[PDB]
Each structure stands twice: as C-alpha cells, then as structure tokens.
Symmetry: C5
Subunit: 338 residues, 5 copies
C-alpha cells in the first residue's frame, strides 16, 4: 500500500479520524509519558528571577485509531506536517514567562507511530522559566529551579501526565554553567493543580544549582579584605601625622561603602540581609573603628605631656594586635557558619 493511501486511510480524508476527540474518549484518561533532553541551560538571572533552557520535549501515549497492520515495520517515522491531523496533549509550562518553537530550517518536530498505535512526539523548545530565589546565603547559596508540565484544558479524568520510568531527564554531555554547578540529582514531583475550573495534571522537575565561590573571592571578598588591611597601616603611622591617618580612615570608610553597594548591584532589591551584607557591614565597622581609634589617639594626646602621649601610644600598640586578632576571629565564625 502506497504511503499516500495509507496516510489517507489512517488520519486523512477517508479515515474518519477526528483530532478533536481524545483516544478512548468514553474510557479512562489518556496516560501520557514525558521525558526531556536538556540541550542548553543558562541565562540564570537573579534580577528578573528566572532562567532559560533549550529542550527536546518528548511525549508518549497510545491512540488505538493509529494502530496499523499494513506494514511489518515496528514503527513509522512520519512527516511532521501530519501532527496537525492527529490528537495530541495540550501540555504547557506553568511557570513559563517566555516560550517559542523552532522553525529553522523546518519545524523542529518529530512524529513516530507504532504498530499498536503508540505515538512518540518530540519537539524542540526554548523556555524562560521563573525561578524564585532565596538569597539569604548569597553568594554561598544553592537555588532550586523548577519546571512544571501541566494540561491547560483537560481535567484528570480525561488526561494524566507522568514522568517516564527510565531516565526522564537527560542532560547534554559536557554542559556547564559559568556561575553554577548543576547537580546530577533532579527531584521529580507532582504539582497537581486545583483551580475553580477543575483539577489538572501537573508534573514537576527540580534542578539544584550550587553557586560557585571563586568569582566572589576575586571580585568582592579579597578586595574588601585588602581595604581592611589598608586601614591597619594607620596604627604604624606617627600620631603627629593627623592628615595622613585621617586620610587613611576616610578613604577606607568611603571605599567600603561603595564596595558595599557594589556587592548588591547585580541583585534584585530584596529587603532581607544576605551573607555578603553581613561581611560588608562588619568590614565597614572594622574600618570605621580604625578611624575612631585615631580620633581617640589624637584627642587623648592634645596636651603634649608625657603621661598623655604614653596613653595615646598604648592605644596604638594594643590596636596593632587587637584589630587583626578580632578580624581573624570574625573570619573563623563567618566561614565556619556558612
């Protein structure tokens, strides 16, 4: 039998096939099985609180009307223009902010049917998905980004999604992210939805992203460390050199404030304290304290007499030990905690 006639008798003019009717429509819900191949994963944005993926979405289900005996072949690969002629599930991504198909150089779609009427339907998609982030531990934070696959129009009595048993989420070999490690373990869950329109099938995959620390050492932690150390050289400068020691205090304090606002510049304007904020605040305190230390030195030594010059000199000699020591102690606590 010629393919033209076969497609005509199976799903075309002479078939009686109505794509507006689901498989087993008077019977139990259609069981759809899903798997995804992650071709690309990136544009993880803290500001807009979202991420981007390029995937192949695979859907599998049985349609008795598409069973065939005219060929011995276990399966038939069909031209994707035939997708418009068959019923298919109405899967959408519930947490999608943007989504598009791929049509270059032709529709990036695949359709395969089997002897028994099983269907395999694969389609390439780009998705911008929302990922609400908890930044309390930033930048030592780990985020969980989800992808929800839901039916828009079919209730659970007509249609049900399920992840495939074997390897439901594959990731392209050698895929890396500059800022994060994508963990190998992905959680699969149900997100069954209850709206005023009914109860809708929904399955979910959760990705765990661990933020890499290196960039923040170079950009943020080490530079701020050096500003703190800079403030300490004041303690070895002559107490008579007021403009020198005051310049050291001013510039370290001011640099520390811009350092602090710069540490948030790439983040959404959240109203809770983050781990980087604690660090910048304490660094700012230490640097401000060094200036206050000189104010005290300059003040107690006003009357240029031995007893008061000695009291001022003692403040300096203690500060040379205590500031670095207290800062080391804070460091122990900070790093151990996070």
């Amino acid at each position: 039998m010629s393919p033209s006639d076969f497609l005509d008798k199976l799903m075309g003019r002479t078939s009686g096939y109505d794509a507006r009717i689901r498989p087993n429509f008077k019977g139990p819900p259609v069981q759809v099985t899903c798997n995804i191949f992650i071709n690309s994963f990136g544009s993880i944005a803290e500001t807009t609180m979202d991420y981007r993926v390029n995937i192949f979405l695979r859907q599998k289900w049985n349609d008795p009307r598409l069973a065939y005996s005219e060929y011995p072949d276990d399966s038939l690969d069909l031209d994707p223009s035939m997708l418009d002629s068959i019923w298919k599930p109405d899967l959408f991504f519930a947490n999608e902010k943007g989504a598009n198909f791929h049509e270059v150089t032709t529709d990036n779609k695949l359709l395969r049917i089997f002897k028994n009427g099983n269907v395999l339907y694969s389609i390439r998609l780009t998705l911008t998905l929302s990922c609400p982030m908890d930044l309390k531990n930033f930048p030592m934070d780990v985020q969980t980004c989800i992808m929800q696959l839901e039916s828009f129009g079919y209730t659970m009595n007509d249609l049900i999604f399920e992840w495939q048993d074997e390897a439901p989420v594959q990731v392209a070999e050698g895929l890396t992210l500059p800022q994060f490690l994508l963990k190998e373990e992905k959680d699969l869950r149900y997100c069954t939805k209850h709206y005023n329109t009914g109860k809708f099938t929904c399955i979910e995959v959760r990705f765990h992203l661990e933020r890499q620390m290196g960039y923040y050492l170079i950009q943020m932690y080490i530079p701020s460390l050096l500003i703190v150390i800079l403030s300490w050289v004041s303690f070895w400068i002559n107490m008579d050199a007021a403009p020198a020691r005051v310049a050291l205090g001013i510039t370290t304090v001011l640099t520390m404030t811009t350092q602090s606002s710069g540490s948030r510049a790439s983040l959404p304007k959240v109203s809770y304290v983050k781990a980087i904020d604690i660090w910048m605040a304490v660094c700012l305190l230490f640097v401000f304290s060094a200036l206050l230390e000189y104010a005290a030195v300059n003040f107690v030594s006003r009357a240029g007499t031995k007893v008061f010059i000695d009291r001022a000199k003692k403040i300096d000699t203690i500060s040379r030990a205590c500031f670095p020591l207290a800062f080391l102690i804070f460091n122990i606590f900070y790093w151990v905690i996070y």
Copy 2:
C-alpha cells in the same frame, strides 16, 4: 441506544449543518449579553517605576449564555471541547484598556479552554501575559503604597449589546505562595466599574485594583544606613585638633561630596519626576548636616586666627557645643522624619 458521534454533534451544533453564525451575538434582538469574569493570577512582577507599569500572567475566565449551544443529546452536564472550536462560536471582545503589551500563549498548543453546558452556558478560559500601565505617586517613596489597576473593557459592543460583571464568588484568585521581592501584595482587592463614554458610544468596563506596599529593608541597607554613616563620619571632625586643618577639611570635603553622589544615586532607578520625595528630604537634610560640619570648622579656623587665649577658647567652645548639638539635632530630625512617614 447509540449515542450521537461527537463529529456529527459538533457539525449540528456549530458546524456546517448548524446554521450557527458566530457574527451574531446571543439574543441579538433581546437584552445585552451578561458576561461574568474572573481571573487567576499565575504571576505578578516586573513592577517598574521608570516605565511606570507592571506585568501579570493570568488565566482570564469568561462566562455567558448562548441558547444556540444548549444540548440534549448527552446526559453530561457539561462538555469539554477542543479549543479549535472557539473560532466557530461567538465570544465577547474583551480587551484590557490600560494594556501596553499583551500576548497569548501557544506552546505547546493554544493555552485555551472551552466548556459548554446543557443549558447553553459557556466557560472560556485563556492564558495571557499583560504589561499594564500603573501611574505611580512617589511623594512618600520609598515608604509608598501604590495602586495598580486592570481594566477589562468591550471594544466594539455598547452597553445595550454587551455587559461585563465580576463573578460573585472569588472573582480574583492568586496562586499560592506568590511573592514579590520589593512589595507586599495586599489580600484585599477593590472591584469597581470604569464605564467608558467615548464619541462612539458607551462601553462596559470593569476594574480590579491591587494594593502594593513597598518593603523598607532594601532602602535601609542601600540608602538610609550608608547615609547615616557619612553623617556620623562628619562628626569625628569635632574631636580632631583644630590645628589639623587639612584633616578636618578633608573630612568636610569627602562627606559633602559623598553625600551629593549618595543623593543622585537615590533617584537613579526612578522616573524623572519634578516633585520632592521622602528620600529627597532625607538626603537633603543629611547633606545640610554634613555641610554644616564643614562650615563649623571654617568658623573654628577663622575665629582662632589670632592665636590668643580668648579666641582659642571661643573656637574650642564652638567644638564642644558641636559635639553635643549635631548628634542631638540629628536625633530630633530622625524622630520627626520617621514619625511623620511611618506612623
């Protein structure tokens, strides 16, 4: 008893053999079609002060009766239909009057739902992304509360042909656990009419208002506390020796200059409005205090030119008063500022 095939049924109801004309409204010689609306807010964000707008992802639900779609061929109270049948039925021409951008969702198929009932009722739900305009009053920024609206209007049907109404029970649902980084979305939403009168006629319009309360925390960290520290910095001058002119002048210069950049930085993310905001008052007063500290030293340096006891003492008195009065005056200002805006 062989029930009628769906194909034949859809043919007889709204297809080739039905005589149904989607260009004609239900009860077209009779009273206006009563449409009932509800929305599910799936997502709510991109609240931008600069462009003065916000973004929502919603399911829009419309309900109305169409006698032509009543059926007796099945016992089922309702039928869920393939959304391709939406092109074959009449439906309202609802648009969003304050929408700047709007799109449907077509991945992996049209995000639309169509359900009809025995008596001819229709339920029509569609997923939409909308950028809606929200004119903001920033006088109290960043202790401001904004009201953002969404207007649902008929474009082509006058009130004698079509009427929108919010559903009685829970017209606006919000997805569980939905939060916004910068705002609190209040539980209470106002519903009202925005009936429109143009030179083309009178048009049905209903409105929902959301109340958004700006969260304070970010502004304490980014703006208020840093500026506070610059003011405190300026005060250390008063404990520095009056002989150290370059030290005390450096303190004055740098605090004044930092305060000016601090001030322009407090507006960088905002539209260029011509009224005074609450953050402006704060930055201006902080700038005044820091400038005053420098002027205080100018006075100290000037009155003590002649190095004589009486004039050195007068300069020293200016410093000892300043150590008490600047922090005291700044505390008083703080009391007034916070009490006025946050109480």
Copy 3:
C-alpha cells in the same frame, strides 16, 4: 431578514461587492474624516528622539454600496471580521518608527454602518513616532511633537483626509506625563506630500510639551550650586593651610567636571550648546577661579613679610565679597534670560 442573508446580500457572496474598488471610483475623491482618542502618551525619549502613544483611530467615510433599507435602525454594529470584506482607506503614519495592532483578546476594531452608507471604523493602535527635538534651552525647553496621517497608495484625486470639525483629538481624563506638561491646545494642519509617485493627502496634529523644571533643580542646579558655595569656604581658611585650600580647589573643580558630563548623560550627543551647558561651564569657571585665587595668595605671600602677607590677606577679603556677588549677578542674568 436574517443578518446572515443581509450580510451576504450587502458585502458577501451574492452582493457583487468588490473591496478593491473605492466608493464612487469614477467620481470625486473619497472624503475621509478622522479623529483620534489618546488613551496613553509617554516614553518621550531624547536619545532616540521619539515618543509613544496608544490611540483609537476613527475614520469616517461614505460608501453608497453599503446603504440599506432592510432595517429601521439608523446604524448597525457589525462583527469586525467583516472589515476584510469592505473597502477602506490605506491610512499610514508617515513619521512612525514602530506600530502595532492589538489582538487580545480579539481584534481591537470596531465597524459601524449607517442607513445612508456612511461607515465608522475605529481601531486601536500603539505608535512610536519620531519627534526631532531642539535642545538649545534644555532643560527649560518646549518641544513640538507631530503625528502625520497619510495615504500610501491613493493620490488626491482618489482619496482625501480631513480632521473632523468637532473635537478631532480627545485625550483621556487625568492623563499626565512625569517630565512634561501636555498643553491643551493642539495645532491641526495639512502636510500634503509630493513624491515622484504623485501627490498624497496628509493631515497632521501637533502637540506641545513643556518640560517640568523641578527634577533639574534637585538633580543638577542645586547640587552644582552647593559645589560653588563649597569652593568659597576656602576664602575663610588660613592661608598657611595650603593642603586644605588646595584640596578644596581640586575636589570642587573635579566634581564640577563630572557634574558637567553627568548633565548630558541622558541626552543625544548634539554638537550645540544647551542652557544646562552654559550653567555648568560658568559654575566650573567660578570654582576654578577660586583655586587660582589661592595660587595667587600662596604666591604673593612667599616672603613671610608684613607687606606681602597683607597683600595676600586683601586678596582673600575681597574674594569673600566678590565671588558670591559675581555669582549672584550671573544668576540674575541666567534665570531672567531663559
């Protein structure tokens, strides 16, 4: 008569109506009357030199083929899908850079026909229109932004646009702009076009936008004023304090240069002098002059003798009066002029 049959006989299968033929095609030009409702008005950008509007565009004209007697109704409101079946004008916006229709939740279009064959056609549009700006007086400038409505394909012998007599341009109640005042008076005129393809109807509306001053006082004028005043404290500082008075000069001069570049950061890179440039330049001069004043004080007082110390002290006492006085005089002239 059923509406279906009526639409069939008027403009459908049995009508003989050809939408490719204009009303009175062998006769005089079609007279189209236009009015707009401005639903929204904003995104006024100096850099890209344009603005954005959301409007309802209303077009009115007579088509004898659409006259009816089958109903007593003065007018009929028709489903907008019938717009594809009737002739309509080919109005475009000549100074449009971007334009879109609105299709959510259905086409934002309105079609009404009258007994005598008049048509009312309204459509919702978003337009980005070009507005060439003259910034000589910025930020005390007033701009004129235009909207041109033109026929693309019909010459004046076939088609003519005209503004409606009564209230051709309506503006939504309570519409405001953050940076501008939109004046109540709008100029209407003709912009008849002559190309090498012929002569084309074109009507124009002009909006007057007056820039609000407040933002620039807060952001630009007052901050620069304070830098000038800052420079003057130098005159009350001891002439022996060289690093103090030189620091005052350096920092005010440098801040004034960044202040100056910052005043243009949001503007197109025009090559003429603006009002804000004059101000920043004079402020820069005053602040530079204060530093030069100290150079003179430091220089004439090198030899630490009474006669030369007195000459340096006289320079300071004059400067305390003359700088503020000269700056006040400049202010009088500047504000009075603009």
Copy 4:
C-alpha cells in the same frame, strides 16, 4: 468593462497569468529600475557598527502580459492585494541585519500599471544595515555607509537591477542627524556578486557621513584641557607644600586615566590607536610630567642649602614657561594634522 472583470481577465481566474514566470522568460533578462526615498535615517551605532533607515523602495519594470487597451487611462492605480497575483523581482538588501514591512493601518504598498505593461511598485521598509567603520581619526572621522540591493534567486541572465537615471535617491526635506552631516553627494555603483551558485545583479548606494565636532569639544577635549591647566598651578605653589603639590599631581593623573577610558566607553573595542587616544595619551603624559617635576623639586632641595634651593626654584620657573609652551606646540601639530 467593469474593474472586476478586467482584473479577472488580466491577472485573475480567466487570465492564464502565472506569477511564477518572469516577463519575457525565454528572452533577455528583466530590466528593473530602482529608486529610493529616504524618509528617515538614524540610529548610527559605532558599537554594533550599523545604521537604520526608513525608505520607500520603488521598482519599475515591463511585463507585456499586463498591457491593456480597455481603458484610455495612461495608468491604473490598483489595490495592493493584487501584488500577490503578479510577478515581481526578489530584491533583498545584502548588508541588512534587520528588515520589516509596514502593515498599519494596511499594507504600506503601492501598485500602478501602465498601458504598455510597465509596472511601478513601491513599498515602505525599515532596514538596519551594517556599516563597518574606520575609527582611526575619531572623532574627526568621516564614514561611508552603503546599501546594497541584490537579487537572491535570479542570475544576471534572468534579472538585472539598475538605478534610475533621474534622481535615484531622494531624501526627505529637513532631515538631519544629531551627530553627523549627511553629504548631498551619494555614490552609485555596481556590486555584482559571484557565488558558487552563480552571478547575481547588485547595485549599491554610498552615503557619506561627517561627524560633528562640537559634542567632543564639550565632553572630552575641553574638560581634558582643564585638567592639564590644573596640573600647572602646582608650579606656582610653594615647594615646601609637599602634600598640596603631590595632591595636584595624583588627582590630575587619576582623573586623566578615567577621562581616557571614558573617551572610548561608547565605542567598539578596536585594537588600533584613534585620534582621541593620541590626545588623551599626550594629556596624560603632560600631567604625569608635572608630578615628576615636583618629585625632582622635592628631591634636589632635600639639603636645605641656598645652592640646592636655588636649583629647585629654577626647575619651577622654567616649568612655568615650558609646560604651557610645549602644550601649545603639541596643540598646533595635533589640530593641523587632523
């Protein structure tokens, strides 16, 4: 003859006209004549190396199948929906990065046919075209931006483009650009293309854009001039005031480095030296030299003896003359060269 019947017999159902066949398909190549009206010209971006135009593209050619005798009219203006029914050239813009039609409120297209079968086809387009820039003389540079009109699918034996003889490129009256002068003279030439698929007709227009100098005087040259002059006040300050004269050196050097990076901020990251780079480098040298001059003054005068104080004082008195003199000489050379 009714227009409906005429269009039917000319290019519709009863015509036998096949738009997939070119005019004179067994004969010589179709001669197409082109002219453009430039409605708008802007968004000249150095970073992305491109520019934007809004144009009316006019194409003219002869199609014997469209000749008519049924009307005395020299030409007929046809509804643009008839464009889908006729053959037309497949002109594309070879250096186009983005391009769109205009469809508000209807298709911005014009179709006119003449007794002898000539066709005039005009269409409105927005184009982003690539313009590779040579920035060696920036910002005293002149750029040449081109527009190439090419056939995609017809070789030279089937289709040939040619600019119109009379006024092939018209520009809207009063069109200006903020940063550039568009010269009146436009070069026309051939860009005939040879690919492995054959030989393709291609015509080119070249626009000459002269960058306006004013913005760069205000933003870049004059501010940097003032920093150089600032550095010179050091020479009149007391050699005993080390922190004052060193502060002058530091701040002018540092301001000059940010001034230098700021002069490139709006430009692509090219690896050759530009005219603004030469200027900033020399300004940086002069300002650095002034600081080195003080290092010498401070160093030679360490031993506080008359002979060495005098030597240091001589260095200052020479510097007061030579720095301004050498800087004037450099200015002469710089401006004269460019």
Copy 5:
C-alpha cells in the same frame, strides 16, 4: 511547441503529478545523501557574557530526487520560483547549538530553488543565527576561542537521511569580512557530531571557527593604565620621608585605583570562578602598589626617634626601594609576557 511552464510544474510536482512531499526520495532504499555548504555573509556580536555569536549565512543543500528528473527541456537546470519549495520534499536541517534563528522575507523570501535534468536539487536559504560558543577565558585577553556550528537532522535517523560537507570549498567567507576584536583564521575544521539520543541516531556535521583575540585594545584600556599607576606609586620613594601625608596619599590612591582597575577588567565578562591572565596581572600590580605603601609605613616607623642611626636606616630602605621595585617589576613582566606570548 515546448510545454508551458504552468503545465510542466503541474505534471512534475503539482495537481496531476502524484508527488507527495511527505515521502523522501528513495524511501524504501538507502538514506538520502545531502551535501551542504555555507556562505558567511556576516559574522559578529561575539559576546563573552551570553557566551554566543551571530552569523548571517546562505545555507546551501544539495540532494537527488528522482521524481524531479525531467526531459521536457534541453536545459541542464531550471531556476524555479521559491513558492514551489512548499510542494517538494526537503531535508529538516536544524542548528543544534542555535539560540536564535530567523528567515529573511524582505522584499520576498530569501530562498533559491534550482532543479537539474537528473533530478538533483539545489536549495539555498538566507539565515541569521545566534549560536552558542562556550568560551575558555583562562588566558584572557590573550585567548583564542573555538566557535562551532552544528547542522543536524531533527526527525530523520541515519538510515533515512545523511548530511555531508561538500568536497570543494564547503565554507566560503565574504571578501573583506573583518571583526573588531578578533581575527577569524582561514583554516576551519570540519567534523562529524553524530548524535545518539533515546529517540535514535541522527546525522550531524560541524564546522569550527578559530578566533584569535586582538591585543591592542587591552594594552590601551587595561595594561598601560595599570602600568602607570604602578610607576606613580614609585615617585613616593623620591619624596621626603618627612612628608607623611604626601607619601600616604600616594599609597592610598594607587591602591584604591588599582582595586577599581581590577574590577573594571572583569566588567564585560561572565562571572567565571577561575583565575584569568588579566587577573594575575591586576593582582600583582595591586601587590606592588600595596608594597610601596607598606614600604613607607616601615620608613615612617623606623625613623620615629629622630636620631642619625635610625634616620639613616630609613633612608637606606628608600634608596634600595628606588632600585628594587622597578627591577622586580621588570622581572615579573619578563615572566608574564614570555609565559602567555609563548605557552
């Protein structure tokens, strides 16, 4: 009388042909052999942040379809109107590493279709592609990157369809094409990237471009300015040890400028967590400048007691520093440039 084109197209691929575009050439036989070549019309927007690049190309595909063989004309080939592309079978080539892609439709579809006597087809189409290019920035900005383009079948397995680069000049580049930041090397690697998914085995061919980053911009913007800050720090060693505020100001400002210089060197880059070549340079420059300030702390400290022996010890620290800092910095430079501009 030769057959009219209308009738010919009708008999070849239209109404009377029996041609079904849903069936591949030789469908019961071996795989269709498709041959590909590209013309690169434009190549740019190489972004480190988004880790991608943009090309404008003509994609050429060649294959044989026996159903399209003709004898009705003596012409070796026929150039057909591209609307006929919808009527013929064609491969389903997609770009596997494409993030964005569009056709070109102004002023008509930028497509070409040519068929030959023996049924060969030539199909060319103009495309704009944003392709992903993962970058290794360890040696930035003396880095060389490899950007790839993968051409794959989406729906046909290797038993039905196979892609192959053309033998003669598979990748042509427009004459005079240059990139501001890079040199595109003349040699392009051609490779197979055959894909094995859970859906089967799919043909995939690959071209690799080598891009060498040009150094000049980084000398002007980054290396030389940082060099001058280091030299600035050295003038301190020739300034009087009594001038504490002068020498401390030199130390502060060079250190602070060096930190902003360092963050500015990464501002245009993705936030990678490894050390780059520019980072090493900025870090060492920062060390040198910090060391100069520490040198003065030592000078100021050892000379506290104003006695000849301790003033002399402080003076010796300065005279050594005048030689050793420039010498040590020269040595570092030798090592740095030799390492990166060789290995």
